[PDB]
């Protein structure tokens, strides 16, 4: 799998993160990210993907060592952490054929795991519209604890 790059954008309070919702297969909510182009630097891919999906340019704010990276089914996904973006920032995707909506979400109210269906005696996880974000949420909370307190 080809690596993906993106960002976790937080507001000034550090309470809220920016998620985007796409269409069809990508119909839930997740962090803005996408597939690296051949010969493209990770920081550049992240800024480009985030710019296309939200209209907000993170290039002046990316810090090289501040990211969270997960390998999920042998695909690397790296999200650069970008704090302090004002909640009144007007976000507008370029790619409005790909992005339905863009919203702030409270970190503390997002799930950091999906629920089972053990109150139904059935194996698996119930659907959750935050499926793509979920795996970053515990690591983000642990990273904010360390970096801030």
Ligand X SMILES: CC(C)c1cc(C(=O)NCc2ccc(F)cc2)[nH]n1
Binding mask 23-52 for ligand X (x = CB under 6 A): --xxxx-x-x--------------------
123 binds ligand X (CB under 6 A): no
Q: Which of 4, 5, 11, 22 binds ligand X (CB under 6 A)?
A: 22
Instruction: Assign 3-class secondary structure to 59-80.
Output: CCCCCCCCEEEEEECCEEEEEE
Q: How far is CA 42 from CA 15, 17, 75, 99, 131, in A?
A: 26, 21, 14, 22, 23
Which residue's CB is nearer to ligand X, number 71 or number 147?
71
Are 136 and 68 in contact, with CB atoms under 8 Å apart? Answer: yes
Shorter beta-carbon distance to ligand X: residue 34 or 145: 34
- By DSSP bridging, strand 99-106 and strand 33-35 are unpaired
Residue 132 as a binder of ligand X (CB under 6 A): the answer is yes
Q: Which residues bind ligand X (CB under 6 A)?
A: 20, 22, 25-28, 30, 32, 53, 98-99, 131-132
């Amino acid at each position: 799998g080809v690596p993906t790059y993106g960002a976790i954008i937080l507001d000034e309070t550090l309470e809220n993160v920016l998620l985007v919702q796409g269409y069809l297969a990508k119909s839930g909510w997740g962090f803005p990210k996408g597939k690296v182009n051949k010969e493209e630097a990770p920081h550049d891919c992240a800024a480009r993907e985030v710019f296309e999906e939200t209209g907000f340019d993170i290039k002046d704010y990316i810090c090289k060592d501040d990211y969270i990276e997960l390998r999920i089914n042998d695909q690397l996904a790296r999200l650069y952490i970008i704090p302090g973006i004002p909640k009144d920032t007007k976000f507008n995707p370029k790619t409005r054929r790909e992005i339905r909506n863009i919203e702030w979400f409270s970190i503390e109210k997002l799930p950091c795991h999906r629920n089972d269906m053990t109150p139904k005696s059935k194996l698996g996880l119930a659907p959750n519209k935050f499926f793509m974000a979920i795996p970053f949420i515990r690591p983000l909370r642990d990273w904010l604890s360390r970096r801030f307190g």
